[model samples]
Target: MKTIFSGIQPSGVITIGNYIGALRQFVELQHEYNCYFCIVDQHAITVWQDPHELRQNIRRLAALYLAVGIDPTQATLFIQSEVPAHAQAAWMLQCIVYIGELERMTQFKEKSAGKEAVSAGLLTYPPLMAADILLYNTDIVPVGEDQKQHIELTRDLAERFNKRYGELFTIPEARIPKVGARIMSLVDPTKKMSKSDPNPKAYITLLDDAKTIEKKIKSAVTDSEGTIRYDKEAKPGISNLLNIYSTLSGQSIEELERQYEGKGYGVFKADLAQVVIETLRPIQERYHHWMESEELDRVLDEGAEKANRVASEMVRKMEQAMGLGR
Candidate 1:
């Protein structure tokens, strides 16, 4: 089986953008691949998360994944920090990747452009990211467009080390999935939906209740013209709704647009609101059940155990790659 390793930071509620773009696919891929779905608690700390809240957020994301149909039995699910090999390999991989390359990363430049109290962890983040993938000897990484550069860096670092040290790593390829990825923010259609927005209305969290989900969709941004169409550039708000609807209802965008012709944004929003509520109902229920049980804890432990097996084997080779010795 081809191994697939991917993770999400435990910073806040898992955004719909996360679901539509990536998590939803994990639900399906679990049946086909050797899937490692990690809750990256260590990555969350790079940006200074509140201690107590961070722990809770980690559990919440794990529960959310279960809620969204990630059969823990099919995928090895765990927290990042639980596997020590990740950090060990990260330190070695950092040396192989150039400082100039890290500086030029689009996310790094954008995030650190005006920050005065930026931490070194923020800059060293990509190396850890590389460690996350290479540790598992992943074959294909399905990630967001924003992360394509980091994956490229992972490929470069792995190839460089292999050239110098005789194939210590399996170089991974980046794969971008077509359809039902990259959901933009509801309040700001142009920007991707993110958990960091200060306004709670900006995102529909996985745990959001039916009423709150409906309210957010009702108030979702749209042009004054009120036409329900499929043009992303012309009507981003409507387009975003269509994207969400497509994912939830499994209807093509063209089919949805054709069915809702001449309908105002209000009708579309109301229908979308209903779809959002109905779509996420089962996930929310499962999340509630996981919260009351030890299932998530067990899943986290098992995922780490599987990752440890891989990371431990890789680090032995990696140490030799850097001449740290047998």
Candidate 2:
């Protein structure tokens, strides 16, 4: 079976954007491929994170993965830091990657633009990401639009290493899903919805209770005209809501527009909120169970064990190719 590699930062509560864009796809891909889902705690630290909270986020993310229907039996799910090869191989790739190339990364530039003292890790993050992907001999790396560039760099670094040292890395392809790929913020539809967005109502976090979901949806920004349409440029707020409604409710955008043809934003938003609440209800129940039970720990431990075996073999080959060990 072809291998798929993807990772998420355990920085905060996962938002609906994360579910629609990535986690949901991961759940489905596990049935057809060898999947590795890593909670990238190491990457989360590029910005400041509390030590205790960081540890909590790691386990919480693991639970969330299981809660979202990523079967541990079918897919390996583990913490990034637990697998030492990621950091080790990342260092090696860092040596291969130039500062100029790293500086050109848009994400690095955006995150470090005005910071007086930027973390070095922020610049070298892509190499670690490349290592994460290459170590698995990953056939596909499911990524969002923002991450496509990182995947391209991974392919470049893989080819560079193979050309210079030997054929040691499998060049991975980016699998960017079309539908619900970029869930926009409720407050400002132009911006991608982020879990860390300080405005709580801007995004629907997966763990949000039904009442909070309703309140957020009711307050979501939309135009005064109140026509239910999907004109991203002209009606971004309504368009974004339409996208979420269609995605979670499994209705076509045209169908949703027709369903709410004469409806105002209030009624549409209320119904959409119910649709979202229904969708997240079961997942939230499962997440709570996993968080409280021993099953979560068992699954993570097994996942780490399996991932370590694969990563160790790859690291050994990479080391041999680079003449790192006697």
Candidate 3:
């Protein structure tokens, strides 16, 4: 089985976007590939996170992962920091990586767009990402369009290391899945649903009480002349909701339009909100239970040991291949 590597940062609460965009896919990938899902705590630290919340975020995400059906038995799910090679190999990759390439990365540019005190990690993020993928000898890296540049950089670094150092790593390619990859925000249909929004209402977090989620969806932006149809250019708000409904309910957009013909946006929005709440119920319940118990720590500890066995071997080989500080 070809190995698949994907990581989610524990910087903020996992939003509806994460469920539709990535976490949902991890559950499906379990049967087909050797998947390694990582809680990238290291990535979250690039931005300042309140320490207590960050720790909670990490465990909450891990519980959420399990809650969403990413069987820890089937997949190697772990915290990235527990496996030291991610950091160790990142430093080695950093040494050989060009400053110009790091600067050119889209995320790096966007993250530093208006910042004065830009952290070095913000610039050098790709190499550490490269290490994350490369350390696993991952053949397929499932990423969104925004992250394509990072995967491309990972490929370049892999090829560069192999060329100079004699075939040290397997170059990983981006795996763009065809459904629900970019989920838009409820408040702003143009923007991706993000936890970064200062407005808490911008996202419906997985942990949200059903009533809160219902209110947000009910208040979701719909045009003045509410026609319940999926027209991206003309009716982006309805279109986004349709996309969410369609993706979750496994109903076609056309079918949804037909189902709700002559219905006002109010009815459509309420129904969609109910669907959202129902879909999230079990995941939230599991998340709460696991979070309240010691299951998460045991999971992380076991996963860390397994991850280290592979990561340490790969980084050690990479070090020898590159003749880095031995």
TM-score of each: 0.96, 0.97, 0.95
Best model per TM-score: 2
* Candidate 3 structure, TM-score to reference: 0.95
Q: For residues 153-193, what per-residue lDDT tens digits would candidate 2 score against the true structure?
A: 99999999999999988899988767688899999999999
* Model 3: lDDT of residue 121: 82
User: What does candidate 1's lDDT look like per residue over 1-326, in tens digits?
Assistant: 89888889987668777887788778878899988888888888888888999989989988987888888789888899999998998999888888898898988987788999889888888999999999998998877666789999999998988898897677898766566567888899998787788888889888889899999999888898877777889988888889899888888888887888888888888888888888788888888999898867988888788889988998997887677965
Between candidates 1 and 3, the one scoring higher on lDDT is 3
| lDDT of candidate 1 at residue 58, scale 0 to 100 | 89
Q: Please give the lDDT score at residue 236 for candidate 3.
A: 78
Off by over 4 Å in 1: none
lDDT of 1 at 99: 89
Clashing pairs in 3: none
* The candidate that achieves the highest lDDT relative to the unseen native structure: 2
Clashes of 1: 1
Clashes of each: 1, 0, 0
Clashing residue pairs in candidate 2 are none
What candidate 2 gets wrong by more than 4 Å, as runs, is none
